[PDB]
Structure 1
Amino acid sequence: STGSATTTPIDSLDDAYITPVQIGTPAQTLNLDFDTGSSDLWVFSSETTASEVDGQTIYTPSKSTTAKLLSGATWSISYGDGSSSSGDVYTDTVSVGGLTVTGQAVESAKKVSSSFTEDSTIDGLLGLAFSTLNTVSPTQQKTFFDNAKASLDSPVFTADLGYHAPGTYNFGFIDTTAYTGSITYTAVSTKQGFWEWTSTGYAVGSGTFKSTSIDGIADTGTTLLYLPATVVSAYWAQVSGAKSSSSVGGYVFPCSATLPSFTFGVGSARIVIPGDYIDFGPISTGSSSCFGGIQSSAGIGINIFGDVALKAAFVVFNGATTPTLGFASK
């Protein structure tokens, strides 16, 4: 089997991408944030505290003839940005782009933090990291991909995120028309539950490539590119007037600037992020200070190849017995 679904930016900045997902019988379609940095499939629901729902589409398990309470199971998750959600668990039929999993754990939110309530465009998350990170207790649950894997033509999924445009998540096959050149594969460590890999270095604009190992995670659920402070300082030093602002929370730059590209290494291959992908617009409406798309990871504990980096590539998440990641230009 295979599946193929379009993923669409939630706003003009590509802050996140939503993909329609069919849950239950008859189908209830919710727009979920596919997140290769977490491993829970959770949804706004008929059980979510009413004051914490503001425009999201909800899953109502009582209206699904295939829903079954997973008795005793609860979940609770906290994300790197400080947001969180928790609740109970149903199993139900879940389909993405024509690919169907029966008995998928659908984690129904009873509580969500304010950042989720305030984003009416995201109806939940669909985790695509390794199932060892799934938060369901007392019986940990498998991700959608883990449940589908055995049925897929090939045990892979691909992320092809658009710049200011829709893109595609495919399951079970690699669309050879969706990228240019060749795909370069690189080793993955699953020891922390993430799609963790080591970039071979970077360049700023037309500058020389610096060969240096940068361990980080491929994370579709994080907007920006978070790298070591040395790398980030070298980037922003090439933008006149750019500076790190403690009050804003990161590097800002004059909106009148033209940003240089940023290149990262994948083995001997190179992925170029155009400068325009690094512009996240005014810090507040009408401001001439703009927020940068490359930020320091120093306060995180891990480097994160988020959407800013991933949308410059066609990315293969290879879930074979020994997982690997592939990157191609496009």
Structure 2
Amino acid sequence: STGSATTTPIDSLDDAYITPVQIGTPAQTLNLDFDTGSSDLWVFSSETTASEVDGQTIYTPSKSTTAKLLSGATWSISYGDGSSSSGDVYTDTVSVGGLTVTGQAVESAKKVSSSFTEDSTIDGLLGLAFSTLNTVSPTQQKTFFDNAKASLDSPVFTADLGYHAPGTYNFGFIDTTAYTGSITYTAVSTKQGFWEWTSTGYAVGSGTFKSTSIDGIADTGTTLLYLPATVVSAYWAQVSGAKSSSSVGGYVFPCSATLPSFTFGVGSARIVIPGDYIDFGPISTGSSSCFGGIQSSAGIGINIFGDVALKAAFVVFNGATTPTLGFASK
């Protein structure tokens, strides 16, 4: 089997991407944030504290003839951005772009943090990291991809995120028309539960490539590119007037600037992030100070190849017995 679904930016800055997901019978379609940095499929629901729902579409398991309470199971998650959610668990039928999993754990939110409530466009998350990170207790549950894998034509999914435009998540096949050149594959460590890999270096604009190992995670659920302070300083030094602002919480730059590209290495291959991908707009409405899309990972504890990086590539998440990651230009 295969699946193919369009993923759409939630706003003009590509702060996140939403993908429609069918849950239950009859189908209830929710727009979920596909997150290769976590492993829970959780949704706003009829059980979510009413004051914490503001415009989201909810899953109502009592209206689904295939929903079954997973007795005794609870979940609770906290994300790197400080947001969180928790609740109980149903199993139900879940379909993404024509690919159907029966008995998928659908984690129903009883509580969500303010960041989730305030974002009307995201109805929940669909985790695509390794199932070892799944938070369901006392019986850990499998991700949608893990459940689908054996049925897929090939045990892979691909992320093709757009810049200020829709893109695609495919399951079970590689669309050879979706990228240019070749796909370069690179080793993955699953020891922390993430799609963790090592970039071979970077360049700033038309500058020379610096060969250096950068361990990080491929994370579709993180907006920005978070890299070591040395790398980030070298990038922003090429933008007149750019500075790190402790008050704002990162590097800012004059909105009048033209940003240089940023290249990262994948083995001997190179992925170029155009300068415009690194512009996240005014820090506040009407400001001439703009927020940078490349930020320091210092104090995150890990480097994160988030959407800023991934959207410059066609990315293969290869879930074979020994997982790997593939990157192509597009």
TM-score (norm 2): 1.00
Deviation at residue 253 of structure 1 after TM alignment: 0.1
What's the CA shift string for 1:196-248, capped at 9, x where partnerless?
00000000000000000000000000000000000000000000000000000
Take 2:100 and 2:27, find their aligned partners in 1: how far apart are those partners?
A: 11
Q: Quote how far apart the aligned CAs of 1:56 are.
A: 0.1
Show structure 2 runs of 5+ residues with no match. none
In 2, the alpha carbon distance for the partners of 1:288 and 1:99 equals: 45
The 2-side partners of 1:150 and 1:206 are apart by 44
What's the CA shift string for 1:240-265, capped at 9, x where partnerless?
Answer: 00000000000000000000000000
| 3-state DSSP of counterpart to 1:117 | helix
Q: In 2, distance between residues paired with 1:11 and 1:272?
A: 23
For each residue in 1:57-102, what CA deviation from the matched residue of structure 2 results, as whole angstroms up to 9, or x when unmatched? 0000000000000000000000000000000000000000000000
1:231 alignment partner, SS class: helix
- Which secondary structure state, in structure 2, belongs to the residue aligned with residue 137 of structure 1? coil
SS across alignment from 1:290: strand
Q: Secondary structure of the residue that 2:85 maps to in structure 1?
A: strand
Alignment partner, residue 159 of structure 1: 159
Query: What runs of 5+ residues in structure 1 fail to find an aligned partner?
Result: none
Measured in 1, the distance between the counterparts of 2:14 and 2:118 equals: 17
The alignment status of 1:35 with 2:35, answered yes or no, reads: yes
Tell me how far apart the structure 2 counterparts of residues 286 and 117 of structure 1 sit (CA, whole Å). Answer: 25
Q: Distance in 2 between matches of 1:97 and 1:148?
A: 13
CA distance in 2, matches of 1:56, 1:281: 25
Secondary structure, counterpart of 2:150 in structure 1: helix
- The 3-state SS of whatever aligns with 2:235 is helix
Give the secondary structure class of the aligned counterpart of 1:148: helix
**1:34 offset after TM fit, Å?**
0.0
Q: Deviations over 1:173-199 (max 9, x none)?
A: 000000000000000000000000000
Q: Note the aligned Cα RMSD (angstroms).
A: 0.1
SS of residue in 2 equivalent to 1:220: coil
Q: What is the SS of the residue equivalent to 2:141?
A: coil
Q: Distance in 1 between matches of 2:288 and 2:42?
A: 38
Match of 1:147 in 2: 147
Distance of 2:97 and 2:108 partners within structure 1: 22
Q: After TM superposition, give the deviation of residue 116 of structure 1 in Å.
A: 0.0
The residue that corresponds to 2:296 in the other structure is: 296
2:81 aligned counterpart, secondary structure: coil
How far apart in 1 are the matches of 2:186 and 2:230? 24
Cα deviation for residue 153 of structure 1 reads 0.1
Question: In structure 2, how many angstroms separate the alpha carbons of the residues matched to 1:254 and 1:120?
Answer: 30
CA deviation vs aligned residue, 1:93-117 (integer Å, no higher than 9, x gap): 0000000000000000000000000
TM-score by length of structure 1 reads 1.00
Secondary structure of the residue that 1:120 maps to in structure 2? coil
What is the rounded CA distance, in whole Å, between the counterparts of 2:274 and 2:180 in structure 1?
16
Separation (CA, whole Å) in 2 of partners of 1:313 and 1:299: 27
Aligned residue for 2:71?
71
Aligned residues: 330
Query: What do the CA deviations read for 1:247-290 (whole angstroms, capped 9, x no partner)?
Result: 00000000000000000000000000000000000000000000
1:312 is paired with a residue whose SS is coil
Cα distance in 2 for residues equivalent to 1:186 and 1:192 = 17
Cα distance, 1:128 vs structure 2: 0.0
Partner of 2:264: 264
What displacement does 1:301 show?
0.2
**How far did 1:299 drift?**
1.5
Q: Name the SS for the 1:300 alignment partner.
A: coil
Q: 1:280-305 deviations in whole A, cap 9, x for unaligned?
A: 00000000000000000001000000
Aligned mates of 1:165, 1:256 — CA distance in 2: 23
In 1, the alpha carbon distance for the partners of 2:277 and 2:299 equals 23
2 CA distance for matches of 1:309 and 1:328?
12
Q: Hey, what's the Cα distance between the residues in 2 that align with 1:87 and 1:36?
A: 21
Return the offset for 1:171. 0.1
Distance across 2 between alignment mates of 1:35 and 1:113: 17
Provide the C-alpha distance between the structure 2 equivalents of 1:126 and 1:288, rounded to a whole number of angstroms.
36
Give the SS at the match of 1:94. Answer: strand
Q: Which residue of 2 aligns with 1:5?
A: 5
Take 1:255 and 1:98, find their aligned partners in 2: how far apart are those partners? 42
Q: Does 1:211 align with 2:217?
A: no
- Over 2 Å off, 4+ runs: none
Distance 2:73 2:249 in 1: 37
Kindly, what percent of the aligned residue pairs are identical?
100
